[PDB]
């Protein structure tokens, strides 16, 4: 995914990378930006030792943006 809509990205001990966008929703991906899908209940520990659980509010928030990406006025 793009890193234009992201505001915070954590590096995961798993080797993946979560791009948390400005809305507060986080797009689960790998550090290369290849779509990596994750269900709810998964513990993502950052390089800080910060445990962030993929919840039903965070699992699929990514694909919807990938369906377009230019104008979008509603
Ligand atoms: Cu995740």
Curated annotation (Swiss-Prot):
Here the disulfide bonds are none
Q: Which GO terms describe its cellular component?
A: periplasmic space
Q: Does the keyword RNA-binding apply?
A: no
User: Its induction, per UniProt?
Assistant: By Cu(2+). Maximally expressed 30 minutes after induction with 0.4 mM copper.
Role played: Involved in resistance to copper. Can bind up to 2 copper ions. Has higher affinity for Cu(+) than for Cu(2+).
Task: Please give the name of this protein.
Answer: Copper resistance protein K
In its keyword annotation, does this UniProt entry include Metal-binding?
yes
Q: Which gene encodes it?
A: copK
User: Which keywords, in A-to-Z order, does the entry hold?
Assistant: Copper, Metal-binding, Periplasm, Plasmid, Signal
Write out the annotated subcellular location: Periplasm
Q: Which domain of life is it from?
A: Bacteria
A GO molecular-function descriptor:
metal ion binding
Could you give the subunit structure recorded for this chain?
Monomer in the copper-bound form. Homodimer as apoprotein. Dissociates into monomers upon copper binding.
């Amino acid at each position: 995914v793009d890193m234009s809509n992201v505001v915070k990205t954590y590096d995961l001990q798993d080797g993946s990378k979560v791009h948390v966008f400005k809305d507060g929703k986080m797009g689960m991906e790998n550090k290369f930006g290849k779509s990596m899908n994750m269900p709810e209940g998964k513990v993502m520990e950052t390089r800080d030792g910060t445990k962030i659980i993929m919840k039903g509010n965070e699992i699929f928030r990514l694909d919807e943006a990938l369906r377009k990406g230019h104008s979008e006025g509603g």
